Design a binder for this molecule. Structure first.
Ligand SMILES: CCCN(CCC)C(=O)c1cc(C)cc(C(=O)N[C@@H](Cc2cc(F)cc(F)c2)[C@H](O)CNCc2cccc(OC)c2)c1
Length: 395
């Protein structure tokens, strides 16, 4: 054995938030610096911040107060799966208080209009799209923030995320004081995980796309053409709460998860991820829900590894409508029409390494994943898997 050291103490515990409202990191924009909380989103590629009054914002970017502000005289429109905003392009000096000690000039979309984007009480005023330029709006010429960071400094072309779910509800006061995790910019901090790191190839550099080759519910093979699992793509997206699955995979997964938890009957609303279910304080029957394993393409030919999540991950802690002493949750898995989305739910159980430089993504058991005395999340390998390339989808 050999104890693993944490070498980025300055960035550890720099995140706050929760799966339901997103995780954010503190940033500064302009001269003098204007402090803002920014949603960490590996699912998009635009750096944008509120730049005008809004019901849900307590503060916003004030361009006229920044001596380093540069107007790009260009409008920008960004529509997500749900939620959208319109803004004005420009550049300015940007820093990360609890990150590498550097300042860089990056593109900034000043949000002037938005619909269903900002979330009441999230405590963040902007978003940080960490994905590639290919999906940046208006187009790939608008250099993403992390690209600017790497090109302008010596920070390694790599970042890692530790999203920490509490395992229980956090009120407004609590979510503000609580540590929500870590975003290590430029490296890997060994104190954030246990066990080994397994890497899966980044299939294509647009979203952080990966390939799932096998799915199990309590060790039982979901048994579908692996191509279904990646229809029309599979991405790692911290900007989305739930594990989202292709319609057919969702139907199969839900049927299998219900069968495994059959000793307990749950209403349709529950399975639709719409309504919560509650249990007497401390009695949540974790053991009746199955673990879910996702096999990922490995880096060696014909080799794969698997990540296993517990219901402590796919069941999201929520406060009871009557703020009682029950432990309540919602089913954090839902159907997609745009492929598989490995959201915050899934990320909370693992330390995820976005190794841009080696075009790969690493997974390791999170030092902060919620579990019980009987089961734990896992990252295991290797497995002999054939024709994995066939699992990828092509239009
Ligand atoms: C996160 C807190 C709760 N929310 C949002 C509020 C209900 C979700 O769980 C959620 C649910 C769905 C169902 C989509 C998105 C969604 O679109 N997330 C965005 C970011 C985001 C947007 C927003 F409005 C509010 C947020 F908090 C976070 C990702 O970038 C999507 N990546 C794929 C994609 C898909 C289409 C276009 C695209 O452009 C890059 C990227 C987010």
């Amino acid at each position: 054995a050999a104890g693993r050291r944490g070498s980025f103490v300055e960035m550890v515990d720099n995140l706050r938030g929760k799966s339901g409202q997103g995780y954010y990191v503190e940033m500064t924009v302009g001269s003098p610096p204007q402090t803002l909380n920014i949603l960490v989103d590996t699912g998009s590629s635009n750096f944008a911040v509120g730049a005008a009054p809004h019901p849900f914002l307590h503060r916003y970017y004030q361009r006229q107060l920044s001596s380093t502000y540069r107007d790009l005289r260009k409008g920008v429109y960004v529509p997500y799966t749900q939620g959208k905003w319109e803004g004005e392009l420009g550049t300015d000096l940007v820093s990360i208080p609890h990150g590498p000690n550097v300042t860089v000039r990056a593109n900034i979309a000043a949000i002037t209009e938005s619909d269903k984007f900002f979330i009441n009480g999230s405590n963040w005023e902007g978003i940080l799209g960490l994905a590639y330029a290919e999906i940046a709006r208006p187009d790939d010429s608008l250099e993403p923030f992390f690209d600017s960071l790497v090109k302008q400094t010596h920070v390694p072309n790599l970042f890692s995320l530790q999203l920490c779910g509490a395992g229980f509800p956090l009120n407004q006061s609590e979510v503000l004081a609580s540590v929500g995790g870590s975003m290590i910019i430029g490296g890997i901090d060994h104190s954030l995980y246990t066990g080994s790191l397994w890497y899966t190839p980044i299939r294509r550099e647009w979203y952080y796309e990966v390939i799932i080759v096998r799915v199990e519910i309590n060790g039982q093979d979901l048994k579908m053409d692996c191509k279904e699992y990646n229809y029309d793509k599979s991405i790692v997206d911290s900007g989305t709460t739930n594990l989202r699955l292709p319609k057919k995979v969702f139907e199969a997964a839900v049927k299998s998860i219900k069968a495994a938890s059959s000793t307990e009957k749950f209403p349709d609303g529950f399975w639709l991820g719409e309504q919560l279910v509650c249990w007497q304080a401390g009695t949540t029957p974790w053991n009746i829900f199955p673990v879910i394993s996702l096999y990922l393409m490995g880096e060696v030919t014909n080799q794969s590894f698997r990540i296993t999540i517990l219901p402590q991950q796919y069941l999201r802690p929520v406060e009871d409508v009557a703020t009682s002493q029950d432990d309540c949750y919602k089913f954090a898995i839902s159907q997609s029409s745009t492929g598989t989305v490995m959201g915050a739910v899934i990320m909370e159980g693992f330390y995820v390494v976005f190794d841009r430089a080696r075009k790969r993504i690493g997974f390791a058991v999170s030092a902060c994943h919620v579990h019980d005395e009987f089961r734990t999340a896992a990252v295991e390998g290797p497995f002999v898997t054939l024709d994995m390339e066939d699992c990828g989808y092509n239009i």
